[PDB]
Amino acid sequence: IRVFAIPPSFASIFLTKSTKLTCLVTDLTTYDSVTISWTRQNGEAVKTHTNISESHPNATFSAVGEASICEDDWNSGERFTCTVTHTDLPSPLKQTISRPKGVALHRPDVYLLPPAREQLNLRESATITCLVTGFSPADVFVQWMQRGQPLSPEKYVTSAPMPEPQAPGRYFAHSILTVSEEEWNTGETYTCVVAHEALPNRVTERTVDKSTGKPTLYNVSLVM
Amino acid sequence: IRVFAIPPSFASIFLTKSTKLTCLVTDLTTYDSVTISWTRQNGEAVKTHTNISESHPNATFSAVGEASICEDDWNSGERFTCTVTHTDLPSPLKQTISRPKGVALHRPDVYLLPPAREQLNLRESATITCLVTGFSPADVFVQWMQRGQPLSPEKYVTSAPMPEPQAPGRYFAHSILTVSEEEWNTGETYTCVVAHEALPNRVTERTVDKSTGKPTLYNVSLVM
Amino acid sequence: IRVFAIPPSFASIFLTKSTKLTCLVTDLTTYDSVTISWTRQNGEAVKTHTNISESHPNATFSAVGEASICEDDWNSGERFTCTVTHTDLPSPLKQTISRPKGVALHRPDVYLLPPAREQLNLRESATITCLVTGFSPADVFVQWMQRGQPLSPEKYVTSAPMPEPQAPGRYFAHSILTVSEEEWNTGETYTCVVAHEALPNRVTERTVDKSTGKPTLYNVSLVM
Amino acid sequence: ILPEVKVEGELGGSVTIKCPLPEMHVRIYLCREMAGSGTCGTVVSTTNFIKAEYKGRVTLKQYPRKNLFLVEVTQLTESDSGVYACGAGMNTDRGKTQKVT
Amino acid sequence: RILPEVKVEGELGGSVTIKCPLPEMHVRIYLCREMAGSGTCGTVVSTTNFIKAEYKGRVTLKQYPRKNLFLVEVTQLTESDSGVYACGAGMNTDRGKTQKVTL
Numbered sequence: 001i002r003v004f005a006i007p008p009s010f011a012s013i014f015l016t017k018s019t020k021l022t023c024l025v026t027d028l029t030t031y032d033s034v035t036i037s038w039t040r041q042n043g044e045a046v047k048t049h050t051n052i053s054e055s056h057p058n059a060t061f062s063a064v065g066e067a068s069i070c071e072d073d074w075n076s077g078e079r080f081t082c083t084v085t086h087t088d089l090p091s092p093l094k095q096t097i098s099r100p101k102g103v104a105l106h107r108p109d110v111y112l113l114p115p116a117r118e119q120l121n122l123r124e125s126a127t128i129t130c131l132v133t134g135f136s137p138a139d140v141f142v143q144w145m146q147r148g149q150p151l152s153p154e155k156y157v158t159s160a161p162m163p164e165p166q167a168p169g170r171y172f173a174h175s176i177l178t179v180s181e182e183e184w185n186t187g188e189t190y191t192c193v194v195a196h197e198a199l200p201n202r203v204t205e206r207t208v209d210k211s212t213g214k215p216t217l218y219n220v221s222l223v224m
Numbered sequence: 225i226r227v228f229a230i231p232p233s234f235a236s237i238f239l240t241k242s243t244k245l246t247c248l249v250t251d252l253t254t255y256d257s258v259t260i261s262w263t264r265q266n267g268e269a270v271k272t273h274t275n276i277s278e279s280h281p282n283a284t285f286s287a288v289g290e291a292s293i294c295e296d297d298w299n300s301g302e303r304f305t306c307t308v309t310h311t312d313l314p315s316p317l318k319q320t321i322s323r324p325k326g327v328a329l330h331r332p333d334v335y336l337l338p339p340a341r342e343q344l345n346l347r348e349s350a351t352i353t354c355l356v357t358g359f360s361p362a363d364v365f366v367q368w369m370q371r372g373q374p375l376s377p378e379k380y381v382t383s384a385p386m387p388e389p390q391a392p393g394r395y396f397a398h399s400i401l402t403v404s405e406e407e408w409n410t411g412e413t414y415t416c417v418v419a420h421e422a423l424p425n426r427v428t429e430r431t432v433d434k435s436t437g438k439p440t441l442y443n444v445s446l447v448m
Numbered sequence: 449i450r451v452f453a454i455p456p457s458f459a460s461i462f463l464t465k466s467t468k469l470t471c472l473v474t475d476l477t478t479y480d481s482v483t484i485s486w487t488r489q490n491g492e493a494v495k496t497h498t499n500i501s502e503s504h505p506n507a508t509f510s511a512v513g514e515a516s517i518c519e520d521d522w523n524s525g526e527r528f529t530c531t532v533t534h535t536d537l538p539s540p541l542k543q544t545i546s547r548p549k550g551v552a553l554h555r556p557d558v559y560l561l562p563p564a565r566e567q568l569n570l571r572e573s574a575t576i577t578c579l580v581t582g583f584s585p586a587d588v589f590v591q592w593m594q595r596g597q598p599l600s601p602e603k604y605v606t607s608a609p610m611p612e613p614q615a616p617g618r619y620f621a622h623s624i625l626t627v628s629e630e631e632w633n634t635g636e637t638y639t640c641v642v643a644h645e646a647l648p649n650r651v652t653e654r655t656v657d658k659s660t661g662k663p664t665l666y667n668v669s670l671v672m
Numbered sequence: 673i674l675p676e677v678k679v680e681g682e683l684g685g686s687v688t689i690k691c692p693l694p695e696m697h698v699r700i701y702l703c704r705e706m707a708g709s710g711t712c713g714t715v716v717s718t719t720n721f722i723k724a725e726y727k728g729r730v731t732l733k734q735y736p737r738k739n740l741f742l743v744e745v746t747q748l749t750e751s752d753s754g755v756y757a758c759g760a761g762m763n764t765d766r767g768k769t770q771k772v773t
Numbered sequence: 774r775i776l777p778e779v780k781v782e783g784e785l786g787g788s789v790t791i792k793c794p795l796p797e798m799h800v801r802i803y804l805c806r807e808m809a810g811s812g813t814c815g816t817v818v819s820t821t822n823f824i825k826a827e828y829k830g831r832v833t834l835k836q837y838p839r840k841n842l843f844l845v846e847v848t849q850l851t852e853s854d855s856g857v858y859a860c861g862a863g864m865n866t867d868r869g870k871t872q873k874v875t876l
């Protein structure tokens with residue numbers, strides 16, 4: 001008899017270019033007339049849901065509620081009221097959702113580590129690992145592009161941000177891309193794209209290939 | 225006899241991080257009562273010209289039509305009507321702008337050309353070039369950066385777009401950032417960051433170093 | 449009815465070596481023998497008409513005439529007074545124009561930057577860029593001279609001069625020539641020819657090919 | 673893989689070659705190897721480049737459902753059957769996928 | 774450098790089965806595929822759950838501990854100019870190859 005609400009994540013803001021607000025119904029009976037009201041904190045109702053979902057087999061009845069505003073309107077710290085009233089949940093619903101001001105703001109450092117030589121010696125799939133250090137807002141969107149076009153999200157597996165031990169406020173996250181060994185040995189792009197608020201252009205890139213790790217093996221001098 | 229409008233550019237959109245719906249009429253009369261109604265195509269007049277300038281018909285509107293709309297579909301999406309009644313106009317001059325939609329979206333191709341050898345030999349200065357060729361809708365926004373620090377716009381100046389010869393629709397642009405030769409001879413990242421609508425996630429940078437052409441595997445030197 | 453004065457440009461006085469004062473009339477329809485009267489300051493320069501057309505798409509074509517004087521006369525700085533007499537205009541008149549004097553002369557510095565390695569990697573086309581800096585009668589005429597003589601003007605594109613970042617008076621321009629990769633790869637010299645006032649004898653030539661970057665003394669080749 | 677599919681031959685005939693289209697929206701091209709340079713040279717690409725010798729005589733076509741990039745040489749002025757190469761990516765030389773003499 | 778050449782000529786309809794020797798020291802195995810002039814055999818299948826893209830779905834592995842053999846079967850076996858399909862054990866792939874196999 002409780003309906004959760006989710007504030008949008010910066011990943012979704014970058015992905016869809018537009019801020020979206022959602023309430024998900026949970027633990028209700030199966031019904032059809034469930035309706036949801038999305039309003040701003042000032043009281044003016046924003047555009048409400050469209051094409052609400054159907055019931056849930058696991059008795060956790062779920063419905064779709066959508067509120068669409070730009071990135072700036074959500075950036076304005078606009079609290080929204082989420083109201084649900086129907087027979088299944090007779091009590092009126094009210095929700096308070098915000099974005100935690102007072103946070104720190106550091107630029108993430110993105111280091112792109114090539115696979116270990118042991119991985120290549122297996123001649124099996126090798127893991128490249130964008131390691132994204134010290135970013136305080138703890139909301140980052142790591143992505144991978146090969147040949148200029150992003151790869152499928154199934155191929156790589158970025159982790160959830162965790163605090164960095166040396167500095168409390170800062171965090172870190174790692175993204176692993178498992179790609180074929182033959183693909184790695186043939187000079188590839190393999191770029192890692194990190195999207196974060198503290199970044200100047202809000203998006204940064206790094207590139208690694210077989211050539212980056214190759215050191216200068218010959219120092220020819222030509223004394224004369 | 226129409227109300228000129230200055231649509232925000234993707235350069236203005238990216239630098240400002242917001243849209244500034246503007247119908248300050250280049251070439252009109254501003255005697256008095258020149259109301260700008262920043263109406264939407266649905267007839268909802270949202271925020272109109274707030275902070276509008278003075279009543280001066282210097283063969284143009286001194287008074288502004290500028291506002292602050294919301295980008296996402298509030299720059300793109302639909303169109304925005306500006307209905308201007310004058311103190312001498314029974315029929316208010318009206319105009320809607322859909323940010324000239326309908327163009328062909330191409331991704332820019334960015335090449336960083338390092339300073340010429342003769343320029344380095346003169347040792348007076350050096351000019352790094354950021355050639356941006358192949359774009360579709362012609363409105364790119366180029367900035368330079370150094371180790372993640374956005375360089376001041378004073379020391380780099382970028383040409384406006386101009387019809388590529390081989391490809392009719394595509395455009396090209398030059399952003400040259402002029403350093404110091406003693407800055408170039410020591411390693412400095414000097415990244416070029418291009419913000420364009422058609423790029424993957426609208427941004428892509430490419431850096432150049434004094435050691436960017438040198439073959440890596442062998443450090444040939446001449447001792448005399 | 450509308451009087452226009454088009455002064456000779458340095459490009460014209462370079463290409464034809466004969467300066468060509470231009471005056472034009474607009475807002476009038478083409479009756480017959482369309483022209484603009486011609487005089488110099490002393491009135492001796494009475495010349496003949498050219499560019500006869502029946503009518504504009506709106507049947508109000510601008511009458512065209514031309515006059516010729518010695519090339520050094522325009523650079524002399526004296527005012528030249530061309531009359532304006534045509535059958536359509538109600539009352540003849542005269543206008544005077546001259547080269548704007550008192551304008552610092554700085555020698556152009558010309559550099560040729562070969563296409564980036566990535567552009568050659570695409571193996572589609574390659575842009576050789578002629579960068580002209582530090583010139584300020586705000587005029588430059590750049591053309592491309594390969595294999596002895598002149599390439600078609602469609603191939604190269606020269607940007608309008610744009611005021612430099614550091615040096616206030618001194619400007620710059622860029623002229624890109626787009627040629628297929630195989631000629632570059634082959635070896636082909638492409639000259640760039642900056643005709644300008646502040647130049648010692650008005651013309652400067654520069655040459656770049658595939659072998660300019662390579663060092664001549666040492667030749668280190670890595671073999672597998 | 674060297675499935676040179678077409679050594680077809682006519683002064684005015686048209687040869688159509690099917691080409692592997694990976695679909696990750698990468699630039700896909702028809703390339704031609706040159707003996708003197710030793711490096712393959714682009715003749716057709718998703719980027720609108722048409723080689724000097726083949727101006728207007730070659731066309732490209734896309735089928736995502738069939739995953740086919742067809743290259744059509746409509747007038748074979750019987751110039752040298754080259755060892756042509758399908759490839760993808762922004763590196764023409766090393767990005768080749770298949771050969772098609 | 775033992776060199777069985779199975780040479781199953783079924784082409785599209787063939788289903789090649791090759792039995793390579795097996796140490797039985799619980800070490801991982803692999804079926805190398807000498808990659809086009811690299812020299813580094815790429816693994817088609819192994820004790821590790823990796824199967825190549827090209828040989829996916831059709832390549833299967835079966836064990837014979839008592840017979841000291843590992844049987845790799847390419848069921849579909851659709852033509853792909855088969856080079857030395859070495860089978861070998863060990864964490865290292867190119868060095869650990871034992872039996873070459875030509876198809």
Ligand SMILES: CC(=O)N[C@@H]1[C@@H](O)[C@H](O)[C@@H](CO)O[C@H]1O
Nearest residue numbers: 219220221222443444445446447
């Ligand atoms: C002349 C030359 O190229 N040799 C250098 C030398 O200057 C340097 O001190 C040392 C270690 O960096 O060995 C070589 O790399």
Ligand SMILES: *[C@@H]1O[C@H](CO)[C@@H](O)[C@H](O)[C@H]1NC(C)=O
Nearest residue numbers: 219435438442443444445446
């Ligand atoms: C070789 O390496 C040294 C290391 O300090 C460096 O100073 C030198 O510039 C290098 N040689 C060249 C030609 O750059």
Ligand SMILES: *[C@@H]1O[C@H](CO)[C@@H](O)[C@H](O)[C@H]1NC(C)=O
Nearest residue numbers: 662663666667668669670671
């Ligand atoms: C210079 O080096 C290149 C590297 O491949 C080589 O091909 C060329 O022959 C060398 N020049 C001379 C004159 O041998």
